[PDB]
Amino acid sequence: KPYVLKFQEIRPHSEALVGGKGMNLGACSNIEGVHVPAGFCLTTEAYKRTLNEFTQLLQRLSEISETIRTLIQHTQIPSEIASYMDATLLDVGGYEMPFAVRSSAAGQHDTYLNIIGKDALLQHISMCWASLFTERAIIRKVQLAVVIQQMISPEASGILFTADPITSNRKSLSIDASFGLGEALVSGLVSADSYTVRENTITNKIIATKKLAIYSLKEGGTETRILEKSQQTKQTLTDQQIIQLAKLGRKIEAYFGKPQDIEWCLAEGAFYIVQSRPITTLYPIPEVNEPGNRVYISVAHQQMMTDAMKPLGLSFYLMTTPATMYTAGGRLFVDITQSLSAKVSRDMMVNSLGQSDPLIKDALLTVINKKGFLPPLPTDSSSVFELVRNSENSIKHLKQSIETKSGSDLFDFIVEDLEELKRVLFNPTSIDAIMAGMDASNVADKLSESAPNNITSQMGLELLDVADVIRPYPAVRAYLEQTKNPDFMNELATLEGGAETKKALEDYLQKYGMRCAGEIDLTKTRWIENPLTLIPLILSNIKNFDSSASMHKFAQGEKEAFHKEQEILRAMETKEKIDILRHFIGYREYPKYGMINRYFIYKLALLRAGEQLVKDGILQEHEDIYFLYFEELREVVRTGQVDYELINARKRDFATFEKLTPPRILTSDGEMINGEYKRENLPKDAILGLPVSSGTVEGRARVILEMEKADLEDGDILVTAYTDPSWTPAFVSIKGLVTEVGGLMTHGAVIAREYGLPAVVGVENATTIIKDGQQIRINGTEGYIEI
Ligand SMILES: Nc1ncnc2c1ncn2[C@@H]1O[C@H](COP(=O)(O)OP(=O)(O)O)[C@@H](O)[C@H]1O
Ligand SMILES: [Mg+2]
């Protein structure tokens, strides 16, 4: 409550009084052995008493802020606030000395360098209040504060990262060094060098053509020019100055406990710190107990599912998998350090996951040959139909036994049923079945086209079946395209056709509504929980199709399958080898279908177990159970208590985890190791990936993440992060496929070869580089855009 706060007198955690930037300076001030330019902060309550008229306008949209901005400029600061300003300013050099006017709120406001005089500073303080109402700051009522510290006139300045911004390696240190002052509004006109330090050794130096530099002229800041070889020839910092700055950086990192973003200035051989912020863009570290250097591999990349998962979702995958895993950033990992400490164990993993995709193999070889990260090495055909029915009989008994149970023994029941889930999924008979399919295997693929009893194939095909019973009744499309409303399946009967489509739509939801995009995450909304997700894909099947499209495109397959059956005819060992393949491989996607069925049954049982948690007065909202791990959730039910400061923490963490993309290889130092494609005799421009389906075509790119933005017309090419079996019904309206992750024999990869759809997977950052709308080119090998 003091009007003016000096840096070394700032109270921990009261940001609201001083602001983030000021609290940072108030923290770096107490760091022994670190020089922070003396100064103080104008209390946010000085911004408040400087204000009856001002409220005239904060009600008016509780672009003419150019009157409310000039008001604060013309509104003069009270004599006492001005007096307190005079005292603390005189203690840090007084007037006749230069100071920096910096505002402290995320976002950005106005900061003014090198201001001298009482009148000039009073004006700039008011201009900083004005920065709150330029049409940028606009898109409530908050309190701003102003930092006033000694203006440094350095030879060099720049930024410092205690962790490599790209690789996220915490034992790496990046420095951006440039001559002259820093910029409040950074423009690409003051370039800088880039140094990289691991520990006391320089690992990388990038010198830049720095033609321009900002110098604090007697008052204000002119931008002079440097001599041609004062740019090139001169490192911004000497080899020792870089190391000195590095040590200076990790002394601040050790103080805050977190990797910091530090702004520095260099005057007369001495360094000064003007700002320090925690880095919030790093990929988190798996919480593991034994101390050595560790290498983790991404389960996400193995499962072709890179999206972040909620706690409860992570739990159910952990309980499903026998192998011990670890969680980091909403993704799961497997510690393979033990297998990379033995030569026999090393190779057997490299060539097992290697040719599957060179990115993993390259990433493995990357970590293996690192600078001593790792220790050196010291001197049956009738089998199908029952497995299907046994699965169906295993689901029916589960579903009518969960409605039986609730409370605490509900969790006792799920844990037990997970064991049954295991011996159905890991059933030797079930995996001996498709071993026969895969061992039955160029010539083999198209010979296996249009094989019945494939659960995901029917899902895509029956959607077309659904599409053609829907269609005559025109009367049912207008309502469909404005509906923001999830419960659209109620007003179908008030209209004609909608009743007869509902029956066809509900029958679909009975067999295929249990899936979704990323079924692996149990907490993710299924199709029957929100049928509004299938709207575009069904409309897309409506916008372009037949009376019985499911018949023909199915029909297409077996006749091209019916002219290859005997190119080879004109040797009867081969005839059923083809079938024991054909009549089987449709089952290769049923264990997946059987598992996620049990998922949804648990979910409904757990959700209603959460609905009783809101009526007991324990839960605020319904689906907050997603942010608790399984065992935590067991205890909340057994107790009647719960920490919501953890829940909200889980909520913001998950939101942070969504902006991240998991690495194929993650180290104990946080370093993200993805693979790299080997390329020459291939176009300069080309973005590289993995070949999946032979073919070359071009067309319009549709970068689509959710299956709700899936407005697919004819000549489009689908560009997404991953292709799930639930994504496969969309393969009827596209011409090409580009995914950030995929395999040579995922189901998407299979039906892409049957339809003749050229597809490329393993294309890193494909949903960021390829902007939606661009005409792109794709080839079975590599594929790049056409401007
Ligand atoms: N007291 C100071 N002396 C010299 N340079 C400074 C001082 N304060 C800030 N700067 C420089 O001004 C630049 C702009 O910082 P600032 O505008 O306060 O951060 P933000 O833009 O986040 O508000 C910084 O990069 C820093 O190098
Ligand atoms: Mg800054």
Author numbering: 2 to 52, 56 to 66, 78 to 120, 131 to 164, 174 to 413, 433 to 494, 509 to 637, 649 to 865
What did the published study say regarding this structure?
We determined the crystal structures of three binary complexes of RPH from L. monocytogenes (RPH-Lm): RPH-Lm·Mg2+·ADP, RPH-Lm·RIF and RPH-Lm·RIF-phosphate (inactivated RIF; RIF-P). While numerous examples of antibiotic kinases have been reported, our structural and molecular studies of RPH reveal that these enzymes are distinct from any known antibiotic kinase and therefore represent a class of enzyme with an unusually wide distribution in bacterial genomes, and a complex catalytic mechanism.
The ATP-binding domain (residues 1–314) has a fold characteristic of ATP-grasp enzymes. The ATP-grasp fold is comprised of two α/β domains that simultaneously bind an ATP molecule between them. Notably, in the absence of ADP, the ATP-grasp domain is largely disordered and in the absence of RIF, regions of the RIF-BD are disordered. The polyphosphate moiety of ATP is positioned by a subset of amino acids, with Arg117 and Thr136 implicated in binding the α-phosphate, an observed interaction between Mg2+ and the α-β phosphodiester oxygen and coordination of the tri-phosphate by Lys22. Finally, in the RPH-Lm·Mg2+·ADP structure, Glu297 appears to be coordinating the catalytic Mg2+ ion. However, replacement of this residue for Ala had no effect on RIF resistance in vivo and the mutant enzyme was catalytically competent towards both reactions in the ATP-grasp and the RIF-BD. Since Mg2+ ought to be tightly bound to ATP, these results reveal that Mg2+ coordination by Glu297 is not necessary for catalysis. In our RPH-Lm structures, the β-phosphate of ADP and the phosphate on RIF-P are 49 Å apart, implying a significant conformational movement involved in RPH-Lm catalytic activity.
